[PDB]
Amino acid sequence: ALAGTIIAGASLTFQVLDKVLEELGKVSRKIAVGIDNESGGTWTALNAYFRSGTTDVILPEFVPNTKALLYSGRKDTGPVATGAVAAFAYYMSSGNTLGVMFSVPFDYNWYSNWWDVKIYSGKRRADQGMYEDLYYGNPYRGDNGWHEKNLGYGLRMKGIMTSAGEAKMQIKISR
Amino acid sequence: ALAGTIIAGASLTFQVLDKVLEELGKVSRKIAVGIDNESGGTWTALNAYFRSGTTDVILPEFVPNTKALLYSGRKDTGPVATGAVAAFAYYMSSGNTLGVMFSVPFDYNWYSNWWDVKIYSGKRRADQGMYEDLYYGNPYRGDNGWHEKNLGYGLRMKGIMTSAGEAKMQIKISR
Amino acid sequence: ALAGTIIAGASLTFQVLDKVLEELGKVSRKIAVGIDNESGGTWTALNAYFRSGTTDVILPEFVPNTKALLYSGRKDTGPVATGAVAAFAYYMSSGNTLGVMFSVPFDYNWYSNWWDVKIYSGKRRADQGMYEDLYYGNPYRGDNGWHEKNLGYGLRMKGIMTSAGEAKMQIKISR
Amino acid sequence: ALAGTIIAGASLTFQVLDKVLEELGKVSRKIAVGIDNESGGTWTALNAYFRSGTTDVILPEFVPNTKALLYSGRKDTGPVATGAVAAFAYYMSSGNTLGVMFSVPFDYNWYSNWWDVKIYSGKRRADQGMYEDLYYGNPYRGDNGWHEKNLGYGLRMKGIMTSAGEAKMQIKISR
Amino acid sequence: ALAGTIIAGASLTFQVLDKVLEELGKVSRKIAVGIDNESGGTWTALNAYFRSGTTDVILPEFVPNTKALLYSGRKDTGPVATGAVAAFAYYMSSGNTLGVMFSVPFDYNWYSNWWDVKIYSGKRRADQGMYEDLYYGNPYRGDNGWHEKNLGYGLRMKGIMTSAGEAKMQIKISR
Amino acid sequence: ALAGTIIAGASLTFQVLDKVLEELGKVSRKIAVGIDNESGGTWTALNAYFRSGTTDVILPEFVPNTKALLYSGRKDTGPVATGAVAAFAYYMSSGNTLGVMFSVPFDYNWYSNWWDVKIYSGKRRADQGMYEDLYYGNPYRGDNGWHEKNLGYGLRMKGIMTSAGEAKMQIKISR
Amino acid sequence: ALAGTIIAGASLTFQVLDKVLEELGKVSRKIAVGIDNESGGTWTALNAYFRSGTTDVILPEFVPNTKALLYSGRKDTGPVATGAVAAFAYYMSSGNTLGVMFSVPFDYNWYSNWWDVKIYSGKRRADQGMYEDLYYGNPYRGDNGWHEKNLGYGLRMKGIMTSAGEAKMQIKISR
Amino acid sequence: ALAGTIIAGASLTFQVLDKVLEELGKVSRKIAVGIDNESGGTWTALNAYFRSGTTDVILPEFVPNTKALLYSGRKDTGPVATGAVAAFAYYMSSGNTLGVMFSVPFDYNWYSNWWDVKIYSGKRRADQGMYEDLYYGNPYRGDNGWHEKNLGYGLRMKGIMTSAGEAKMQIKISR
Ligand SMILES: CC(C)CCC[C@@H](C)[C@H]1CC[C@H]2[C@@H]3CC=C4C[C@@H](O)CC[C@]4(C)[C@H]3CC[C@]12C
Ligand SMILES: CC(C)CCC[C@@H](C)[C@H]1CC[C@H]2[C@@H]3CC=C4C[C@@H](O)CC[C@]4(C)[C@H]3CC[C@]12C
Numbered sequence A, B, C, D, E, F, G, H: 001a002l003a004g005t006i007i008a009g010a011s012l013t014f015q016v017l018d019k020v021l022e023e024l025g026k027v028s029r030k031i032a033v034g035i036d037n038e039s040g041g042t043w044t045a046l047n048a049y050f051r052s053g054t055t056d057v058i059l060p061e062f063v064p065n066t067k068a069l070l071y072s073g074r075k076d077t078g079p080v081a082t083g084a085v086a087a088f089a090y091y092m093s094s095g096n097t098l099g100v101m102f103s104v105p106f107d108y109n110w111y112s113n114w115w116d117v118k119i120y121s122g123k124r125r126a127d128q129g130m131y132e133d134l135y136y137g138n139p140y141r142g143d144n145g146w147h148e149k150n151l152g153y154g155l156r157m158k159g160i161m162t163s164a165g166e167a168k169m170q171i172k173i174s175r
């Protein structure tokens, strides 16, 4: 009976697809970001632009001097094969913008964790352009290594990002 | 046997529908709203009009000056493909109405999170008209970005709404 | 074999009915009622008449002045397609009766939440007549909106009822 | 094969009976009873006679003046279609017996909650006769309403019983 | 095929027996016994003789005057259709023995709860003879009723036993 | 098909054996032993010899005068039809050995709980011989009864063992 | 159909192997070792050599005089039929090495628990040679018995090991 | 029917693969690392290079003198047959680099736990070269044994690594 075999095959297809979707839904991609502000002035949040994923918290409005920013991101809920990729911008009291990019990809056999920090002149909101500038420029690997560079404008950066799918990023901005 | 194949196909259909309804019922759409009142006077609640969804709390009767409003909304219980969309109104002591709209849709490949704040002359209750004015005017995206505008009548607004299906919205109204 | 097909169909019927009855039993209809008494005298409970549903608490015997009544209702246990509909009466010290109606229906595509408050001359127990008077008169919608009216006899009402199947109602009676 | 069809039908019958017995065993009928004693003297327990059901507590030996009796009853354990129906007796210090009846039936489309209180001359134990006198006399409905009557011998009663299958009963006996 | 039908029937038999044995194993028969000693002297435990069942505690060695005995019994573990039936004996300081019998049967449509208290001259250990004397004499029903009698030797008893399969017994021995 | 019937019968056999082994592994046999030492001197542990079962605690090294020994035993883990049977020895300061035997069998329709206490001249370790001397001599039944005897050497014993598969034994040794 | 019978048999084989591997994985073999040091000097850990199994703790670096060593071992994770067998060595301040062997086998119908303690001249690391010397010499049984011997060099040992698969070992080394 | 047998075999294959992937995902490989710094100066983290696995913590930025480093590593999430293998580097205040390697493999019948510590001239980041130098040089086995060596530059090392798949490593660096 053709119909009986079709029903058996459709049932097997249903079981396999159910398992596959459950597996895809259990994949975890998220990041916890901490940034120390020793720049000498308050930071004012502009926006976070998520190329992939979303967040369960609002971008904290202010980061006073000698205080820390706590932020986080995660992939979209469900069996969707995307990660947590974003760039966010804080307007500094010195009159320039601190842009921070992270990328925690879904497919780890084509991509890796990446991150970068840059200073943009004036007031600059995070968007796809800023994310492309940070990601396709010279970003750091999320390689469990500490990295240091002069940001310019009398500011320097020191930070690290882990290599895990549930990533941690720690950065200090100093003057 | 035709009847046996019909019964097998019906059993498979029942399994598939049970799975689909369970997944539809597991979709989460909700919003938590905080509004700081620095206008210089008490706010008196008028009403919340839900275009979609409902709420587990009553609209707080009063918001005193320098205090905050806590409110929330959620989608309807069950496998129903709708979100949490509403506009609510607070009569301010200055004699005008603060109207706030949020939209957290169900289907995110056609819609996005949106929100807006406006002041209406006199005492004005939230209804479908207020929701349409806010949503089909010039609303902000729930895009994880802070936005500021002059509300008029000596009042200004600064706020943010996240992009998640479980959204957070934070607004401060200031004079 | 006719008997074998009958057994297979009966088994499928049993599975479907089991699921349907479980789903019907999971539907939740309940209400939490709070009423502030600022009338200037004690209220004495008469009775609550439930058109639909029941309650897990006794109608509180007294509500002193400046105190609040806490009451609740819910639908009947099991896969029964009814809601929580009632009218209850408190004898006020002024010599008249405060009647309160709520309706939280089961089927939300034919009915909505409704509520009302009225004052009846003398001592009047809640019954089907009082429920019909409140429900088929000019009741308020449970629309997440605050409503105000003069009850008469030097008393006024201000209250709100939410639109959810698990509803909250808040009322204040004032003089 | 006749035997194979008999075995299939027997398996279906066993599944259906298992389901039915589980549901019958999940039905809950019970009552929690509180009685305030303001008669001016101690009450001494005589006995509780359960027409249906049983109890997890002993009838409290004494109820001193200005104290309260806490008692309870429940239906029999298992898939048995019976409720919690009883009459219990307390010998009052005045020399007469306070008899209290409650009925929380199993089948609510033939029966309802009922209760009553009476005083019997002298010392009188609860039995089937007392239960029949209270139940087939003029009992109150467990209808969420407060009721008052003069018990005689200088005593009066005020009480209420809820309409739920998990019932609450509150009575005060006063002089 | 005869063998295939035999395997199908044996599988159904195994399922039915598994369910029946589980149900039999879930039946609960136990008793909690409290006895107040106001006799004027210490009691010294002799033994408890269990006609049915066993216990999870040792018979307390002594019961001083104005103190209480706490004891318990239960049916045997597993799908065995027996109850908790025992008689236990305490040697009183006056030189005679207090024997106490309880019976909590398994099959409640042939038996009921029963209990009794007696005083035996001298030192008398509990055995089958004592249990038969108490059970087949004039025992009290576990009927939720308080009972009183003169034990003799200047001692009297007042006690009660509930009618449940998880029974409570409370007795006071007084002089 | 012979092979298909063999496979069906083997599957049924595997199910039955799995159930039987699970039930056998759920049988509980254990004992908790307390021994009060009022002999006037310290006891020094020699050894415990387990005819059946084992223990989760070490034999306490010393039991000082007026202190108590806590010990325990249990049946072997798994679906093995054996109980907790042992004899253990404490060398008393008076120069003789206190030997204690307990038996909590697996199969209760052939065996019963038994226990005994004896004093052996000099220093004597527990072994199969000591266990046989105590068990096949004149042991007490674990029958929920207190028993007393003169141990000799100026020492006497009073103790009790319960009849349960999870047994409790309490002994006091006195001088 | 040969293929269908092969598939049915392979499925049964899979079920049986899954159960067997789960059973093997639940077998527990572990040991907790405590050693009191009353030798008069500090012990310095050298190494533990595991003939079978592993450990979740590091060999404690030092055991000061009048302090205790806490160590543990266990069998390898998974359905592997091996136990917890080891010898470990502590260099004593007197210039010689304390070697301790334990064996907790997997298969208890061919092996038993064993243990021993020895002193080796000089500094001697634990290895297969030391384990063979202790295990194939004259080791003590883990028989729930206390054992005493003169270790030499002015030192003596007193200890005990239980007979369980989850074993406890207590040893004191004294001078 | 060829298609029916193919579907049955595919269903069995899917069950077997599901079981195998679940078991592979349950394998646990991780390491917890503690390093005491008694060198006389602060350590500054450079980086950790993971040949296999990843980590849930960032490499601690600094290790002050007389303080300890806490670090950890684990295998990649999912049914991937790899372990936790890494080398990490701390720049010491003396001007040289402390490099530490650990290896906790997945397949224990081809590999074993290994570890090593070395000092490299100047500032030297961990990479594949450092890992190869440590692992294919003369590393210590994670064999539950303490090991000591002179690191040079006036520094010495003493440490231990356990043999478990959930490994612990303790090292002290001293001057
Ligand atoms: C072959 C037979 C059994 C098909 C029966 C039609 C099924 C597929 C139809 C009938 C009723 C339908 C539902 C009706 C209403 C809703 C609520 C809506 O917000 C989302 C879709 C959902 C949940 C529909 C899903 C599809 C549905 C279950
Ligand atoms: C076809 C065969 C298997 C039918 C067997 C008859 C079944 C349906 C009968 C036999 C015994 C019956 C039970 C006997 C006693 C009680 C207790 C009563 O308070 C509620 C009904 C209940 C629980 C009955 C339900 C129906 C029942 C289980």
Ligand SMILES: CC(C)CCC[C@@H](C)[C@H]1CC[C@H]2[C@@H]3CC=C4C[C@@H](O)CC[C@]4(C)[C@H]3CC[C@]12C
Binding pocket: E013, E017, E024, E079, E080, E081, E082
């Ligand atoms: C067709 C074949 C498999 C039938 C085998 C007979 C079955 C039904 C018999 C054999 C042994 C029996 C058990 C033997 C002992 C007891 C303990 C008693 O206190 C209650 C009944 C109970 C639990 C019996 C229930 C019925 C029983 C399980």
Ligand SMILES: CC(C)CCC[C@@H](C)[C@H]1CC[C@H]2[C@@H]3CC=C4C[C@@H](O)CC[C@]4(C)[C@H]3CC[C@]12C
Binding pocket: F013, F017, F024, F079, F080, F081, F082
């Ligand atoms: C038809 C084939 C599969 C039958 C195989 C024989 C079965 C029934 C036999 C083989 C080994 C046996 C077990 C061997 C040892 C023990 C430990 C003993 O203390 C209780 C019984 C128990 C648990 C036996 C139960 C019965 C048993 C499982």
Ligand SMILES: CC(C)CCC[C@@H](C)[C@H]1CC[C@H]2[C@@H]3CC=C4C[C@@H](O)CC[C@]4(C)[C@H]3CC[C@]12C
Binding pocket: G013, G017, G024, G079, G080, G081, G082
């Ligand atoms: C008919 C086919 C499927 C049979 C395949 C052979 C099976 C029975 C064999 C192959 C590999 C074997 C395992 C190999 C290794 C171990 C670890 C050892 O410490 C205990 C036994 C155990 C767990 C073996 C059990 C039996 C085993 C699973």
Ligand SMILES: CC(C)CCC[C@@H](C)[C@H]1CC[C@H]2[C@@H]3CC=C4C[C@@H](O)CC[C@]4(C)[C@H]3CC[C@]12C
Binding pocket: H013, H017, H024, H079, H080, H081, H082
């Ligand atoms: C008959 C058909 C369905 C066979 C399909 C091939 C199966 C057996 C193959 C295809 C892909 C394979 C996997 C690919 C990658 C990995 C990660 C590796 O670290 C461990 C093995 C594992 C998990 C492989 C296991 C075997 C695997 C699942």
